[PDB]
């Protein structure tokens, strides 16, 4: 429900899955970062019926 | 007379450096995985390098079962901890 109607595109970020790595002696843990996408939806249909 | 005539292990120089605390082949680090064994006639572990391959041998007069068992256990624990393949 976008009846507030302030904007035309609506974004919903995607969240991925983390990885698991082996922990070795005297070795620092591997830090993980993910570059995530987003799902965008538009307001593009404008329909009318007149007489 | 029950004698152990050969107890040798073959590694790469990188893996040996991981296990010998970064020291080269002919020197055995006292804080490494090849130290702390039972000495009966001298240094119980010898190591040599030849074309990227490191051979680790229990010394000639130090091949009792305690040294063999402890060396095998240290190698297993080090391979499991460091994720190093131990192909028989």
TrEMBL record, chain A:
Superkingdom of the source species: Viruses
The protein's name: Major capsid protein
Source species: Anabaena phage A-4L
UniProtKB/TrEMBL annotation, chain B:
Protein name: Uncharacterized protein
């Amino acid at each position: 429900d976008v009846t507030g109607k302030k904007g035309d595109r609506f974004h919903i970020p995607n969240i991925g899955r983390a990885s698991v790595f082996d922990k070795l002696p005297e070795t620092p843990v591997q830090l993980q970062a993910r570059q995530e996408s987003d799902f965008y939806v538009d307001i593009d249909k404008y329909k009318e019926s007149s007489f | 007379a029950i004698t152990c005539t050969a107890c040798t292990f073959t590694m790469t120089d990188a893996e040996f450096a991981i296990l010998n605390e970064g020291v080269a082949a002919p020197t055995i680090d006292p804080r490494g995985s090849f130290a702390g064994l039972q000495s009966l006639s001298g240094a119980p572990i010898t190591a040599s390098a030849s074309a990227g391959t490191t051979t680790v041998v229990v010394a000639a007069s130090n091949r009792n079962d305690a040294n063999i068992r402890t060396l095998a256990q240290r190698l297993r624990r080090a391979a499991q901890a460091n994720r190093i393949t131990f192909t028989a």
